[PDB]
Design a protein around this ligand. Sequence first.
Ligand SMILES: C[C@@H]1CN(C(=O)c2cnsn2)[C@@H](C)CO1
Length: 150
Amino acid sequence: NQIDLNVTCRYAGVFHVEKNGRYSISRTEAADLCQAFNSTLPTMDQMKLALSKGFETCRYGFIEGNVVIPRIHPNAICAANHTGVYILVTSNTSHYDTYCFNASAPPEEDCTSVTDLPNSFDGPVTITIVNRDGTRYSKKGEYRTHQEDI
Ligand SMILES: C[C@@H]1CN(C(=O)c2cnsn2)[C@@H](C)CO1
């Protein structure tokens, strides 16, 4: 009973979280997941400031109100070559990655590793935070509050 959470650097508190190496997070699960990181879904303004500090990914993820990809460099296979905060307009499906915002993080680029999931609750799952440099932090618990997400 294991969940891997791959996380990035933070940029003005905003970071990306991919669960189990595939698009697998619902909107309800995303809010609960950021809450376990003492974080919230970023606002569009918070995401635009993170972008300005150096944040980009090549993966769709929830923010408050939309599903987006922050892009700095145009790449044909990432958000159809767009730059800026690219907003997903048309999709049949409901599961993506998520972004999270931690107000207590540093103001600009923070590429240190994430070493804790401070607000997860008691439960049976081995939850492993996997950093881009491969460093891992694991704990037994749960973060999903909606049964349909389990
Ligand atoms: C990234 C922020 C802070 N954080 C960390 O584990 C951390 C430790 N050192 S740097 N980042 C988690 C609470 C998620 O929200």
